[model samples]
Target chain A: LQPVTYSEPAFWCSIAYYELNQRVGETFHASQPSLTVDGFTDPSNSERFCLGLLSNVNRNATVEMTRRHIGRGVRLYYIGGEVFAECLSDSAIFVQSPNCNQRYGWHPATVCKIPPGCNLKIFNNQEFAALLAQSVNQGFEAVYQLTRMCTIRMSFVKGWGAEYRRQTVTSTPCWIELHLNGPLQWLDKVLTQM
Target chain B: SQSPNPNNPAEYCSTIPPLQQAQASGALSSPPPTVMVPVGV
Candidate 1:
């Protein structure tokens, strides 16, 4: 696996998508998914975990749309969307699924770990595939459009601050310039359901 | 210089970062931030 970026679930939660999304998806494509509590600012505090998705392109989808962020780069995750998986940089989505093994790496500390037990059923390949597809369905809107909806239409969360802080809400939405398949699968699931 | 916190308007504060803190302390010189819209999302 390639070296991990940030540690601590809260920080990981805060920076997860932003830091690692722009990387090479091939390295982690076949790797097992894990439920990570590593993105939180405090590892002891399970409430801070961040969820990251990794995926492969089951089938390449046509570029339905494109959005660009100046000085950075043009948006590029939707060009391919088929089979995939979702995970934090540190955890596996497979373990988060229905057929999860007791020893297989589910999260007691994160990933919606259920009540009365650590082995929780949150998502599966079917669920993840739909999610990936939904991202494609939503297509690329302006970040400000998302931010505006998040601030105005939403009940919680006011304006997004400029920097990455406890109060700041900057979603670093990144597409795996290339997919390993996990996130793509998740994306497919997401979009299909949406 | 003493001033109100950018986040909390009611009180004077000192918890700003080193870069911000140094500017507050008059130990460093810097320009303030300028507002601009992000060209794209």
Candidate 2:
């Protein structure tokens, strides 16, 4: 597999999951047509950035301490010029889209719970393009920073909200963070031409 | 059920603006108007 380059745009995004214990790992950027994140020793998917077969440090009323919840976890695909996530795991995964709860217009955003075997449209090229255009045109300092630094996050097996005990994903045991640098570089090109 | 139910995964999730709300948003759907850029310091 080709390692992702910084710019010039070869891949859609770079992925890095939170460390299970204190051990650090490499940032995984995708170039493949698809990725499956099931936490097993399958030679078929050992290279992808899936939850690995390892132990968690939290051993109180915290995490379940087993990988059963991450079974056949999730699959990501770059399709129809949009990034989509399919929940293949037995448990649900919470997807917090970039500013999902922040109001982009009159309507406020929302966080989504992706149940097992269900699918969700996580990102779109056009939606991002529109946001970039708006930021450039309006020159809102707050908004432009959003264009540069926005991210989509996914937590496996559990969720955070009024229903769950945890209030934020940072408190959630297992999850992954994704940075869509491909679109940002594409935005960078428009700036160059103008 | 309002509580956690492993059998009912849907209990833990909700679509914003909801069923009637979804119908409402779609009916009201249109794009935001464009804003023009101006020179600034």
Candidate 3:
């Protein structure tokens, strides 16, 4: 299971907006397209460096234009492998219903309600955000399920500005959830082991 | 996550409350899919 070297250490899932400066003489790349995802195990493309995730959404409907919301919403799991990638930025926003009270009931009415009041109308289920991004990319293949080591908790049914206003306005329809994280650090993806 | 707003974002958005103005207008209603909130953990 241990073959993800590059010094066997890569991390992310805490970058709310961005910052992963390798610094020490510099050699960073990816002016764009660093964040990727195709299939699963051995499917490749996660050399970390996903820096600051993404979200610069600009609403004008009249003039302004600063569109760029590539936040898969926190996920890079696979401490073993199944494939994960949700990070629109660090996690939780729901509506896939395993009936655990409607599968996390719209991320507590838009994040532990206080005034969030479930605004985005629970993502209106139009294919539930690509089936919650293929169920968190198959939760990184459920970390190859040998028992444990896999832990995906992304939800977000209607948060993160209604999925960036359902991918930028369009016709004013809505749904948002841009949470993120799978552990880039905290002692090697949450206190070692994997 | 609530113990440090002495004053920052343009003077803590003027005086905050109403659930901190619903977490700062629901955190800009979107602009923090992760906004990297890690510090001195």
Q: Which candidate is the best by lDDT?
A: 2
DockQ score for model 2:
0.07
Clashes of 2: 1
Candidate 3 chain A lDDT trough over 10 residues, lowest sum = A17-26
Best by DockQ: 2
Query: What is candidate 2's CA lDDT for residue A117?
Result: 69
Off by over 4 Å in 3: A1-140, A144-192, B1-41
Off by over 4 Å in 2: A1-8, A19-24, A43-47, A54-61, A64-66, A99-109, A140-143, A148-150, A190-194, B1-41
lDDT of 2 by residue, A14-121 (tens): 776653332324567777746776655454443266556444454334444435577787777654345567787888787776643332221122346778767655
**What DockQ does every candidate get?**
0.01, 0.07, 0.03
What are the per-residue Cα lDDT tens digits for candidate 2 across B1-41? 13333334364333331223224433124332222334443
Name the DockQ score for candidate 3.
0.03
Cα distance off (Å), candidate 2, residue A74: 0.9
- Model 2, C-alpha of B14: deviation from truth (Å): 14
Evaluation by TM-score, superior candidate among 2 and 3: 2
What does candidate 3's lDDT look like per residue over A1-194, in tens digits?
22121121233222222111111111222122123321122322344333232222442432111112223323232221112233233222222211111223333222221111111111112122223333333443432221111122222223222344432212221222112222222123312223
Interface RMSD of each: 22.0, 13.0, 16.4
Cα shift from native, residue A82, model 3 (Å): 26
What's each prediction's TM-score?
Answer: 0.19, 0.66, 0.19
